[PDB]
């Protein structure tokens with residue numbers, strides 16, 4: 001049954017709560033973004049109202065076959081009334097279509113739910129500016145100081161330069177990029193752009209990208225694998241066996257693979273700068289793990305929360321152990337006391 005941190009008290013609303021059957025008292029179900037841990041439960045048989053972004057709506061309709069009558073897309077940065085309550089959707093800087101939700105409760109309390117987010121200083125000049133917030137439901141994925149990683153811009157610079165160098169030295173090299181969900185599309189799009197290629201993929205992945213409102217997408221992607229020198233593969237295929245196997249299918253067209261496995265944080269970020277990253281290599285195959293994050297670093301999270309100054313914080317990630325909960329509460333207290341409060 002539905003946990004407390006997914007219910008919005010004083011309303012009939014839940015957030016990312018589709019795996020518990022019919023939730024008692026819920027008149028509208030919000031979905032922050034199209035990642036499987038968050039949408040788990042939605043299908044053609046769902047018959048309650050779903051509120052979400054336009055992009056999330058396109059994915060519900062086309063990938064999950066949710067009926068059009070139950071999909072309620074809302075524009076961003078716009079005051080909307082849903083079942084007698086004012087709400088706003090804001091860009092979460094996570095994956096395409098991902099939002100944060102501001103709820104203005106009938107009693108005067110204001111709640112921000114971040115969904116999944118990568119905090120950025122630009123959020124300090126959204127509709128959040130000068131908005132008192134009484135409760136923050138916070139994506140705490142990386143709420144500990146050891147979690148460091150580079151900017152997305154720096155990671156993309158490394159990937160572009162690495163790919164362009166390799167293919168310029170060897171015009172018969174193939175570039176492969178791993179994927180298992182939406183998000184991190186800039187990795188493969190930026191590489192293909194520098195190489196003057198479309199990105200080749202399966203019919204199923206092509207379908208998914210066609211839902212994302214990316215400008216000029218028809219010019220960037222294709223299902224014709226033979227015409228492309230940047231290929232997308234499921235993430236589980238990005239290993240020496242899987243890549244060797246893939247190289248056979250291309251019909252003696254290529255003699256080297258350079259592959260990228262986008263990850264979240266990993267322990268090697270503690271020691272190695274993004275510039276100094278080296279691949280795993282076996283013969284003519286090389287694999288780069290690159291830390292492209294769509295969640296806040298510890299420092300980004302701390303900056304956002306110290307700016308917002310919420311009265312109370314409810315974590316939504318790492319909530320399962322006493323140690324995790326204790327650690328997170330200690331950091332929130334440090335941040336408050338530090339800020340002069």
Ligand SMILES: COc1ccc2cccc(CCNC(C)=O)c2c1
Pocket residue numbers: 305306307308309310311312313332333335336339341
């Ligand atoms: C619950 O944890 C925090 C964490 C950071 C904070 C930073 C600044 C202020 C507060 C609480 C007081 N808010 C006002 C507007 O007076 C924080 C509370």
Ligand code: NI
Pocket residue numbers: 033035094116
């Ligand atoms: Ni997510």
